[PDB]
């Protein structure tokens, strides 16, 4: 991947929003088949334009407005809010109190600056092959739930642009959930109690609910691949001093000599697996899993999914810093998802210059546009199924 040049952005933007973005698929989606009054005409979208000017209550009549105004404003940022009771572009029009958010997707945001104390490869704001296993775990941990625990069927994950991944819970019954319930969702799916810098941030009790236990089951298939060989979480005392800080002080001394005489974390983990295991029996706290948790379990932002009116980054947008396309995820191949191979808007605008419209196909953008289509197709299903039956 060649260096993304952010001074070219103003050039590439009008060319991308002109010939490569998926307007057809974006409408078809937020439109949800015109099954209802004005679900798109009442949908809010936010754009960050030139000079950093931030406009918000935008709204449109049809797919056509979307283009003209988006090829005429070439935004640097684009967000999808919720659908209100009256045309967003017309709130000056209404009384103050009758204009309100009524429905929006249920979105979950998982970023990399949330595990700034668990990674030993990247800085807060960056990522690389070695710690990206954290986004894949978050993926099947919650996607898992939303589907298994709640029965949410149409989950669309996308690439946030640089160090995280977002979720779009689009089941019809979900877009209309009360904020109160949405908070209940995150509450259920949340385990890392990160206080004002507290060492131990994962406490378990003797009985461990299904998700907790199913989750720990999925934090096991990746555990040593990532934490003990990719991260080598316990190769130094500085490093291991940090994992001991979760176990009861009386265990240290023994483990401290256990890893001193060991020569790689892999053997150092098997060591606590014992000591602690031995700890458990005579004393339990499940020391083995509480640490795999505070290191492998997703950390969400409550304000994000809670708000039924929160503006979140629009899929297939462009990231100003890295340039990468905010691509939807292919859950049939989570563990094969590559952030590093994700199409650059510069790169995709180069592939159309080295060349009824389907030229998105002629770019490497094409593969991510199909995962978006299978999504629109599974939804067509629901409408069809659920309604016409």
């Amino acid at each position: 991947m060649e260096t993304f040049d952010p001074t070219e952005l103003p050039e590439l933007l009008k060319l991308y929003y002109r010939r490569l973005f998926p307007y057809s698929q974006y409408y078809r989606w937020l439109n949800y088949g015109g099954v209802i009054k004005n679900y798109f005409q009442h949908r809010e979208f936010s754009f960050t334009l030139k000079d950093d000017i931030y406009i918000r209550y935008q709204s449109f009549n049809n797919q056509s407005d979307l283009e003209k105004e988006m090829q005429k404003m070439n935004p640097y940022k684009i967000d999808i809010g919720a659908v209100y009771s009256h045309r967003p572009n017309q709130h000056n029009t209404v009384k103050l109190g009758a204009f309100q958010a009524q429905e929006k997707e249920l979105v979950f945001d998982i970023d990399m600056t949330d595990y700034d104390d668990v990674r030993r490869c990247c800085s807060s704001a960056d990522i690389c092959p070695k710690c990206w296993t954290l986004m894949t775990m978050a993926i099947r941990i919650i996607d898992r739930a939303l589907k298994e625990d709640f029965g949410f069927k149409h989950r669309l994950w996308v690439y946030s642009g640089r160090r995280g991944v977002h979720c779009w819970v689009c089941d019809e019954s979900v877009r209309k959930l009360s904020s109160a319930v949405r908070s209940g969702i995150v509450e259920y799916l949340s385990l890392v109690k990160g206080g004002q810098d507290v060492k131990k941030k994962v406490h378990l009790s003797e009985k461990i609910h299904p998700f907790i236990r199913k989750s720990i089951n999925i934090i096991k298939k990746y555990f040593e691949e990532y934490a003990l060989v990719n991260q080598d979480i316990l190769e130094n005392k500085e490093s291991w001093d940090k994992i001991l800080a979760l176990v009861p002080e009386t265990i240290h001394d023994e483990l401290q000599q256990s890893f001193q005489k060991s020569h790689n974390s892999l053997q150092r983990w098997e060591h606590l697996k014992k000591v602690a295991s031995r700890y458990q029996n005579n004393i339990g706290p499940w020391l083995e899993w509480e640490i795999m948790l505070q290191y492998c379990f997703p950390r969400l932002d409550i304000n994000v999914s809670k708000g039924i009116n929160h503006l979140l980054k629009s899929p297939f947008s462009v990231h100003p810093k890295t340039g990468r396309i905010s691509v939807p995820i292919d859950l049939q191949k989570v563990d094969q998802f590559d952030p590093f191979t994700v199409p650059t808007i510069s790169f995709i605008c180069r592939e159309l210059d080295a060349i009824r419209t389907r030229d998105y196909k002629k770019t490497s953008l094409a593969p991510y546009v199909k995962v978006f289509e299978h999504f629109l197709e599974n939804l067509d299903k629901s409408r069809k199924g659920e309604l016409l039956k």
């Binding site: 009384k95 103050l96 109190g97 009758a98």
Partner: protein
């Protein structure tokens, strides 16, 4: 307005008769009630997060000026004609407000 049934009867001991200072006048302030705050078509006081509206913003100034005046009446080594002046200007700013209500109902 509410009326509490008077305890007909005599009273040996003292009777403290307390009262409120310009009731509906203040209420149209407390609960930001207005022609651009309230939802109408016995509606619901909008939320305390909405800003003032035309009406409160004119009952606002109405006491922003009773502030100044109550304070310039504190000044000493002052014109004992302006004493009687400020006093009336007081009472006025007062009346206007109150009836602000009688204006809506």
């Amino acid at each position: 307005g509410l009326v509490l049934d008077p305890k007909v009867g005599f009273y040996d001991k003292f009777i403290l008769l307390l009262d409120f200072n310009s009731l509906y006048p203040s209420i149209i302030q407390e609960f930001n009630i207005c022609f651009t705050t309230v939802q109408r078509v016995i509606p619901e006081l909008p939320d305390p997060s909405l800003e003032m509206g035309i009406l409160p913003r004119e009952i606002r100034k109405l006491v922003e000026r009773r502030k100044q005046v109550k304070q310039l009446m504190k000044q000493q080594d002052l014109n004992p004609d302006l004493i009687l002046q400020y006093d009336i200007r007081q009472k006025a700013l007062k009346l206007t407000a109150n009836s602000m209500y009688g204006c809506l109902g």
